[PDB]
């Protein structure tokens, strides 16, 4: 079990937790703000998944300061995790190419 694979896996579990915590924290942060739409868990969760992936649909977003703070944590966690996987694939590709040359 290599480091890059363990990291990829740890990042996945971690991202899943961030999404969940984020879903809960967003509702708690947004309810109480007139016009807020990130006020129920089911869509908050869909919102966090679309924030971590940055898919950008524009159908849901935070309007309060803490929601936005929560939003940054999810964004960064998402961008970082998917980037870590990229790095884990590079380590894989570099290692087997080295083999295909002997070393």
């Amino acid at each position, epitope marked *: 079990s290599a480091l890059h694979w363990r990291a990829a896996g740890a990042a996945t579990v971690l991202l899943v937790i961030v999404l969940l915590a984020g879903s*809960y924290l967003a509702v*708690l942060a947004e*309810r*109480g*703000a*007139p*016009g807020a739409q990130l*006020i*129920t*868990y089911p869509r908050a969760l869909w919102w966090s998944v679309e924030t971590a992936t940055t898919v950008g649909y524009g159908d849901l977003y935070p309007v309060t300061l803490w929601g936005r703070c929560v939003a940054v944590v999810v964004m960064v966690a998402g961008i970082t995790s998917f980037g870590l996987v990229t790095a884990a694939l590079a380590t894989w590709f570099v290692g087997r190419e080295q083999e295909r040359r002997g070393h």
Partner: antibody
Amino acid sequence: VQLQQPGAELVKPGASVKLSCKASGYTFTSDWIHWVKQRPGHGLEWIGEIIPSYGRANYNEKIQKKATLTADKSSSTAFMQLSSLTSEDSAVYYCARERGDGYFAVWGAGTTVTVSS
Amino acid sequence: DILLTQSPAILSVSPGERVSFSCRASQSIGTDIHWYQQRTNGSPRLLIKYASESISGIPSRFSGSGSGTDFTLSINSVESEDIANYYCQQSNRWPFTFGSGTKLEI
């Protein structure tokens, strides 16, 4: 019986009463308890909400703030503090449970609050 | 906040007919509308959630439709027990808000 609310409360003008709502059954951390005001013959007016497993409360800002929400995690009871009441504050006050999904699946029988000397 | 207008305040119909209640929202809210039934001296009772999802324990006689800013609660074959006040409720934007209510009359 989801929400248990006392049948009534008599209150003198200027005085203040504290209503209770004892819940039971499936309880989650994502649960919100709501309070709704119904003046005889009229419709339903949303007062405020509380998230028990955190104690955060939100109030309807379009009306005069006469309430104060609180919760006691151990006895699974939600409380509403109505202060300095007048004839306008006389009505039935319901409490309801919301699973963070936006609709009130269950209500309390309601507590009739009367304000007179 | 979101204003929910309930068209005719009173609805008079004959036994057995199909009847429809209207709920107009001041802005687009998807399908985040819910209907409640309240009888004389009773408390509100959730009938339909998210505009059309039936609730367990509710007569199949009840159904809902719409999305955006126009919603309808329908009862196929009205009857005595259905005499009550009906209210819509939105969960799209925070303050939640309720409709003014519609009384069914046979």
